[PDB]
Amino acid sequence: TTKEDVLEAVKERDVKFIRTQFTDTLGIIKSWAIPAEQLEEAFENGVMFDGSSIQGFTRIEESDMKLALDPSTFRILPWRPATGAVARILGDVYLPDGNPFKGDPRYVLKTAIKEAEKMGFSMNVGPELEFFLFKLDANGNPTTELTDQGGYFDFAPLDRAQDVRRDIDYALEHMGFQIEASHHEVAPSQHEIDFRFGDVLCTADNVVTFKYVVKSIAYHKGYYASFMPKPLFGVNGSGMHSNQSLFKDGKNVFYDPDTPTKLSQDAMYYIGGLLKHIREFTAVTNPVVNSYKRLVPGYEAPVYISWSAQNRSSLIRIPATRGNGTRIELRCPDPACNPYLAFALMLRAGLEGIKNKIDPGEPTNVNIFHLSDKEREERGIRSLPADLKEAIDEMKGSKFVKEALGEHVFSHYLCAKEMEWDEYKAVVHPWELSRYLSML
Amino acid sequence: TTKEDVLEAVKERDVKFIRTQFTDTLGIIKSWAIPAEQLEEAFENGVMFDGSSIQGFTRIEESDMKLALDPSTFRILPWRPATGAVARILGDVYLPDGNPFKGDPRYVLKTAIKEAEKMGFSMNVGPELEFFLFKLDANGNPTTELTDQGGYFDFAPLDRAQDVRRDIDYALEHMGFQIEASHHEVAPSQHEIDFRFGDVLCTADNVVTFKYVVKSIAYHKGYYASFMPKPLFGVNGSGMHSNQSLFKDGKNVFYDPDTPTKLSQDAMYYIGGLLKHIREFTAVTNPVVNSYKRLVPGYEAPVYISWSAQNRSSLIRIPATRGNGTRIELRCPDPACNPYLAFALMLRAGLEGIKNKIDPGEPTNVNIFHLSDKEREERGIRSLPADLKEAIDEMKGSKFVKEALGEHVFSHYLCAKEMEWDEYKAVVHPWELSRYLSML
Amino acid sequence: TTKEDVLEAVKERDVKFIRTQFTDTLGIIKSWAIPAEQLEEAFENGVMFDGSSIQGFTRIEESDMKLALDPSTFRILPWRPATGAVARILGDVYLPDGNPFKGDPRYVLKTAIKEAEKMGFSMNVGPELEFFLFKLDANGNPTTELTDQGGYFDFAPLDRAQDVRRDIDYALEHMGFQIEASHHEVAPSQHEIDFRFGDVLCTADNVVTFKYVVKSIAYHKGYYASFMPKPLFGVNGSGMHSNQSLFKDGKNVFYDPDTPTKLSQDAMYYIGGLLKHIREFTAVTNPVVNSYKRLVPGYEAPVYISWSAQNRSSLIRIPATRGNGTRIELRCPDPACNPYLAFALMLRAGLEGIKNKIDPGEPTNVNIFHLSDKEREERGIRSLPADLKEAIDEMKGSKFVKEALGEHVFSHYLCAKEMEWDEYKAVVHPWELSRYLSML
Ligand SMILES: Nc1ncnc2c1ncn2[C@@H]1O[C@H](COP(=O)(O)OP(=O)(O)O)[C@@H](O)[C@H]1O
Ligand SMILES: Nc1ncnc2c1ncn2[C@@H]1O[C@H](COP(=O)(O)OP(=O)(O)O)[C@@H](O)[C@H]1O
Ligand SMILES: Nc1ncnc2c1ncn2[C@@H]1O[C@H](COP(=O)(O)OP(=O)(O)O)[C@@H](O)[C@H]1O
Ligand SMILES: C[S@](=O)(CC[C@H](N)C(=O)O)=NP(=O)(O)O
Ligand SMILES: C[S@](=O)(CC[C@H](N)C(=O)O)=NP(=O)(O)O
Ligand SMILES: C[S@](=O)(CC[C@H](N)C(=O)O)=NP(=O)(O)O
Ligand SMILES: [Mg+2]
Ligand SMILES: [Mg+2]
Ligand SMILES: [Mg+2]
Ligand SMILES: [Mg+2]
Ligand SMILES: [Mg+2]
Ligand SMILES: [Mg+2]
Ligand SMILES: [Mg+2]
Ligand SMILES: [Mg+2]
Ligand SMILES: [Mg+2]
């Protein structure tokens, strides 16, 4: 798809508004509309916006930013009226002088893809995204009231969101997605939708799309879709399971029928590199305070650093599917993260495993939550950052994460997350009053 | 049907989503949707799911499970829209490598069918599960409020669920059910729908279907369908009378016009066999704590172990119908049980009766509830397990049930029921506060 | 005062009930009443109780505990009726075989006092206890609603605890306290009563007596006295400043009339030891999760390890008073701490500072909250443990704190605090739903 095909699709399908979109450094999608009559000149001039009103983008005395449109991302939004049909287009962020903005999260992922190509590979991540369907209130703003008390794979009337989950599938299919499965998840009113994997760029655009498509579809039905990692205590949390495989010559490099476990050496080294660096960018994968209330044992979320086949208690699970389905599933990432930065760091953590032949230890093919602390330390197992501050500390000292993100993204990400933590740590919570007020 | 017929029916009838379904060990239906485009892939590769999130199924270190589809069990759900028509397919659970997971209740029932064939028989059970129709609250959750005060065979306006029952029959007919009759039952808001008998596999699939079809239609019509055996006190409860029969060369083996009572010797031995073993697997037919509030005298629910013709106070009634309709009605089970396990155990017990020529005693052709304890003890009549713990104890000590179920199903059924009961024996109920708390 | 004097006072002042009391490991006062008629024999037989129902005392297999009475602690409670006058007696916890149970906080403080005696010193401590006065709801339960909006030294009607503080001072004077000054504190509805210092044992007893006297007096007037460090956010917290000096031959050892700053060398060494060991037992001085929400900058609660004269932003302030009155004010602790453990650890740290001439650096006669991180790092200033887990970690690796507390107190304190933190670390607070749940 070129700029000329987008204009033809705008005329043929009667598009009136194009929503130019980009993602800010914290993974939030920023969008604004232009008339179709402007598209042409936009394509040769770029749209202009204010970078000082975007998180971690640019300062107020140098605030003008340009957005250059990517014609390949032209999609048509199906939940908006077909008369004045509304399309969307994602773009890259440029400085007004003309150079690409190094602070663009979508540029970091492109830079990582460059190194992947230099080594002759291409990441083919495809994520599992889970969300919660809560009820709205009179005004129409989010709540945490459950829409049902169902469980895993539960049928109606325990599962009350199947009519609201057909339309998500339909919208995704109209937006170029390839749905694979759709089901209720372990937590009450928690659902998960899986779509086919693809290139890292397309998959990250799909992640941000999927998120806002799901939220918009839920809103127009009376509910609210929340991709918050741990909205409820004592039940499962939402994860963003990142299954990834390297592809060379259009073949799965991670597959090897001759070796035991049908896992090639490049997959072993990729795992080794992924484990050597996960501690450093857990801040990126789990970027909010809530994402660390999900990393507690007993809810199928990782707490320690390990890897084993078929083990949904471990960090790097290897599903049983071999052949063109041989991938590694990283289970830490949360749907609240920035997919561009997260995928970039995953990509070049594996590429540090291949260039340095980083052998991981023996797999821990056992439940790790049912181990003593002595058992865990004797086996060499280490734990993930306990809270967001510990992850921030592990991230600041990193040279790998700074080299991957770059100075601007590194510094601005850290500055936002430190402010978040400083706001969090001073707060007095109702738990503290209900625990200490009467006893002291 | 076959694979190709399913695809032809998906194209011809315009099916968009296929709901792949199975049954967990405790009898709950677990389903999830895949696009029709995925169907051809799911027939050659199976659909993978998490076994660790299914009750009594598999552990979290080897949690991957495959599910292979059964083309014959392909139906089209009528209460879902006809534009994006939704079908369902039941499957058999497999270990991810190649094996037919033995913890699957469907596999247990198939194993019992194998022994039936080895003896040259085929069970033809047809059940008559009852249910209650309660009202939903403002949110739409189940309540125990009555939808009518009617009784047995009551007409309107005492019977207020004629439209609900008519639409349930309509949907069941579209799902391939041969409806026999439909009526109000003794308890208020309690209804019963009867469909033709068939092969035990088909009728177990039909039991699970019937249940979720009824529940979904009731939900969409405003009410809640409850298969709880004893939802209300003082009124009779819901049971799943299993009318069992053996067929050889397409002829009812239990029929014998020359013998008195028109019951063959094989029927006699089957009665003796499943009378000697019921105490052992009452924890399967009656699997929940509420299941034994139903087994109290005075409500046409069995309390003792006996058989007699047309006696609705006895454990094994023999209806008056002879000829092709000659069967034996085991009245103990609830609709809360797992039909795959329950029918398997009944079939195995009957076949064990036939092998060892187990003659039952004389038929107790009296109201057993009216007999005294001395009368029952002198007549040799035994009682069923009084509560869930007694049934668990009678079941774990048995070798017949362990052989029939297998180690995995046996142990994971015990464990589940023991944890269920241990959570119930420690509860302080408002009955104890209404009785005590003022006298003490 | 001895047993004979206690009996004489019981007869003379018409006492019927004696509240035998002791402090548990976590600082909570546990008491029970015995009739005066039993006193005469309790003195020679102790009073037996159940140690398994006391936090960190003993196990259920060996739960029988004895408590011996201390006649010197006999006080008469003035807020209870004078007809059947009620007295109190603090006890020492023994073991039924007969030995000074080492898990007793009183025993730990007594061991620290013995350690001091060998060096010729006697520790004098004057606590600085602040509290909040909140309203009680309809049922008489604690709330967090303010009883006034006054500030520091505010007069009525801005200060609305005139009568409450007047009667608290009266009760404390009746219980042998020498009241120094009562005033309104910085936070709204925060109050401070100061009493004269004394021997560390006597003032450790006074600390628990003060808290329960204040709580009872406030309760009888319709309020709730809260000794919670940080019950409200954005407002000063309650701290228990430990003013401490060393006396040798009835003279203040910390005073030196001919020396700059008029502080003796022993005072300098005591400061050095306190500073060098503070990080290790911050889990004792600040033992609850809420005590580290008080240790935030901008509220006159210390955040960093420093010392300077008249600096209320410093960890160790040295007030301007000299002569009899020269002390060091450790501002770290909060009222929620166990005074017996806290004073014991401070005394041991100071004595360890004196034994090895631990010179502290130059004082930081500067506001430290206003310094940058770079400035603090350049000056070598270390920060206090950021949260309860950090303090727990710093305490576990300590050999000094284990030496002072002992194996039993050490281990049981660690266990209680780790359980507390693990309960707190997994909670989802409303702050997380107000911040996220719309952003995500
Ligand atoms: N070779 C591959 N490389 C990367 N991702 C893949 C590959 N094969 C499958 N996937 C993706 O893995 C995801 C697995 O999702 P799903 O099977 O629903 O959950 P789980 O695998 O945790 O049971 C799918 O979204 C799919 O697109
Ligand atoms: N030969 C047979 N074998 C097994 N089941 C049968 C046979 N004949 C009839 N049935 C079943 O017995 C059930 C009888 O139900 P119904 O007559 O409504 O209640 P009841 O028999 O208790 O009065 C029907 O569902 C029918 O399918
Ligand atoms: N020599 C001393 N040793 C120990 N404590 C002392 C000494 N002199 C006074 N104190 C105590 O110091 C405390 C000072 O309280 P306060 O007047 O509020 O001081 P500040 O306002 O500086 O905190 C009093 O409780 C008093 O008993
Ligand atoms: C059953 S679950 O196993 C739930 C995982 C949980 N929500 C989490 O990873 O945080 N994971 P998956 O969808 O990969 O099967
Ligand atoms: C009158 S009843 O006859 C008794 C049903 C009752 N609810 C029971 O628990 O078995 N059932 P049916 O007529 O189907 O034999
Ligand atoms: C005005 S205050 O300065 C109170 C400080 C605060 N309550 C705290 O130490 O946490 N200090 P002090 O009581 O010693 O005079
Ligand atoms: Mg999934
Ligand atoms: Mg999932
Ligand atoms: Mg997964
Ligand atoms: Mg019937
Ligand atoms: Mg019936
Ligand atoms: Mg019947
Ligand atoms: Mg003061
Ligand atoms: Mg003060
Ligand atoms: Mg002070």
What does B23-46 look like in DSSP terms, one character per residue? E-TTS-EEEEEEEGGGHHHHHHH-
Peptide bond into B157 cis (omega under 30): yes
| CB of A7 closer than 8 Å to CB of A77 | no
Q: How is residue A313 written in tokens? A: 């208690």
Which amino acid, B362?
E
Q: Would you call C440 and A386 a contact, using CB atoms and an 8 Å cutoff?
A: no
- Choose the closest CB to C440 out of A227, A424, A438: A227
CA distance B86 to chain A (A): 10
Phi, psi of C111 (to 5 degrees): -65, -40
Note if B50 is an active site residue.
yes
A378 CB-near residues (< 8 Å, 6+ apart)? none
DSSP C252: B
| C-alpha to C-alpha distance for A270 and A203, rounded to whole angstroms | 20
Q: Would you call B96 and A367 a contact, using CB atoms and an 8 Å cutoff?
A: no
Chain B residue with minimum CA distance to A152: B53
Experimental method: cryo-EM
Tell whether ligand 2 has an atom less than 6 A from the beta carbon of residue B243.
Answer: yes
Looking up tokens 């019992």 gives B112
| C-alpha to C-alpha distance for C279 and C398, rounded to whole angstroms | 10
Binding residues of A for Mg(2+): 128, 130, 185, 192, 241, 329
C98: left (phi over 0), alpha (psi -120 to 50) or beta: left
**C166 CB near a chain A CB, below 8 Å?**
no
| CB of A316 closer than 8 Å to CB of A271 | yes
| CB of B337 closer than 8 Å to CB of B273 | no
Residues of chain B in contact with residue A152, where contact means CB-CB under 8 angstroms, are 30, 50, 53-54
Exposed / middle / buried, residue B300 (Cβ in 10 Å: 0-12, 13-18, 19+): middle
Among C335, C331, C274, smallest CA distance to C303 is for C331
Q: To 10 degrees, the CA torsion angle through C362, C366, C369, C375?
A: -60
**C60 CB near a chain A CB, below 8 Å?**
no
Peptide bond into A157 cis (omega under 30): yes
Q: Would you call B35 and A311 a contact, using CB atoms and an 8 Å cutoff?
A: no
Chain A residue with minimum CA distance to B63: A310
Q: Would you call C430 and A430 a contact, using CB atoms and an 8 Å cutoff?
A: yes
- Beta strand pairing call for C304-305 and B304-305: unpaired
Among B275, B283, B378, smallest CA distance to B333 is for B283
CA distance B39 to chain A (A): 10
Q: Would you call A153 and B64 a contact, using CB atoms and an 8 Å cutoff?
A: no
Number of other residues whose CB lies within 10 A of the CB of residue B238: 24
**A430 CB near a chain C CB, below 8 Å?**
yes
| Distance set, CA C145 to CA B164, C192, C222, C394 (Å) | 54, 18, 13, 36
Among B36, B35, B28, smallest CA distance to B53 is for B28
Helix, strand, or coil here: B225?
strand
A153 CB-near residues (< 8 Å, 6+ apart)? A183, A184, B30, B31, B32, B49, B53, B54
Phi, psi of A144 (to 5 degrees): -120, 15
| CB of A198 closer than 8 Å to CB of A206 | yes
Tell whether ligand 2 has an atom less than 6 A from the beta carbon of residue B180.
Answer: yes
Helix, strand, or coil here: C387?
coil
Q: Which atom of ligand 6 is nearest to the CA of C192?
A: 13
Q: Which atom of ligand 1 is nearest to the CA of B64?
A: 23
Q: How is residue C128 written in tokens? A: 């600085």
CA distance A63 to chain B (A): 46
Among A131, A134, A65, smallest CA distance to A101 is for A65
CA distance B13 to chain A (A): 18
| C-alpha to C-alpha distance for C431 and C435, rounded to whole angstroms | 6
Chain A residue with minimum CA distance to B80: A163
Q: Would you call A181 and B34 a contact, using CB atoms and an 8 Å cutoff?
A: yes
Number of other residues whose CB lies within 10 A of the CB of residue B133: 25
| Distance set, CA C58 to CA A75, C55, C63, C100, C408 (Å) | 69, 8, 6, 14, 9
**A260 CB near a chain B CB, below 8 Å?**
no
Looking up tokens 């476990």 gives A261
Sign of CA dihedral A424, A430, A434, A438: positive
- Beta strand pairing call for B142-146 and B130-136: antiparallel
Residues present in chain A in total: 440
Note if C130 is an active site residue.
yes
Tell whether ligand 6 has an atom less than 6 A from the beta carbon of residue C186.
Answer: yes
| C-alpha to C-alpha distance for A142 and B189, rounded to whole angstroms | 38
B124 CB-near residues (< 8 Å, 6+ apart)? B197, B198, B199, B200, B244, B245, B246, B247, B327
C228 CB-near residues (< 8 Å, 6+ apart)? A432, A433, A436, A437, A440, C132, C238, C290, C335, C336
Q: How is residue C50 written in tokens? A: 């159940």
| C-alpha to C-alpha distance for B321 and C281, rounded to whole angstroms | 85
A with C: 3 or more CB pairs under 8 Å? yes
Among C429, C384, C377, C283, smallest CA distance to A423 is for C429
CA of C126 to the centre of ligand 3 (A): 6
Exposed / middle / buried, residue C82 (Cβ in 10 Å: 0-12, 13-18, 19+): exposed
Number of other residues whose CB lies within 10 A of the CB of residue B37: 14
